[PDB]
Amino acid sequence: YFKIYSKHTPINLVRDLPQGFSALEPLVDLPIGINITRFQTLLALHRSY
Amino acid sequence: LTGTGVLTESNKKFLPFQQFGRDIADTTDAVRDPQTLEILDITPCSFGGV
Ligand SMILES: *[C@@H]1O[C@H](CO)[C@@H](O)[C@H](O)[C@H]1NC(C)=O
Ligand SMILES: *[C@@H]1O[C@H](CO)[C@@H](O)[C@H](O)[C@H]1NC(C)=O
């Protein structure tokens, strides 16, 4: 069971994420059961001219 | 859920993912209607000693 949680909260600090408490509601349960051991972050770059 | 009780229309705020609800420890007091979206409230009906 792939429990995905998300909580979009606005903030005015750029770095050094502030303290406090927040909740995380389950988004959607994904059907899983395969073997996963390595997570890879995939970002997006903005090619200019 | 299964059993006996009073089904009332409370004002609890049930989140979309939430389905059931307990009170203190494994005592269900409010559920969600399977067909519709309205929120019920399972309340134990009148009891007491004579
Ligand atoms: C998943 O694959 C890795 C890769 O070698 C292995 O070490 C691990 O035991 C595997 N886990 C399961 C549950 O198959
Ligand atoms: C389920 O069926 C009942 C039958 O009248 C209907 O009132 C209700 O709106 C239906 N629920 C959904 C989610 O379609």
From Swiss-Prot, chain B:
Effect of residue 2 to K: In strain: Omicron/BA.1
Function: Attaches the virion to the cell membrane by interacting with host receptor, initiating the infection. The major receptor is host ACE2. When S2/S2' has been cleaved, binding to the receptor triggers direct fusion at the cell membrane. When S2/S2' has not been cleaved, binding to the receptor results in internalization of the virus by endocytosis using host TFRC and GRM2 and leading to fusion of the virion membrane with the host endosomal membrane. Alternatively, may use NRP1/NRP2 and integrin as entry receptors.
Assembly, per entry: Binds to host ACE2. RBD also interacts with the N-linked glycan on 'Asn-90' of ACE2. Cleavage of S generates a polybasic C-terminal sequence on S1 that binds to host Neuropilin-1 (NRP1) and Neuropilin-2 (NRP2) receptors. Interacts with host integrin alpha-5/beta-1 (ITGA5:ITGB1) and with ACE2 in complex with integrin alpha-5/beta-1 (ITGA5:ITGB1). May interact via cytoplasmic c-terminus with M protein. May interact (via N-terminus) with host bilirubin and biliverdin, thereby preventing antibody binding to the SARS-CoV-2 spike NTD via an allosteric mechanism.
Name of the protein this chain belongs to: Spike protein S1
Gene name linked to the record: S
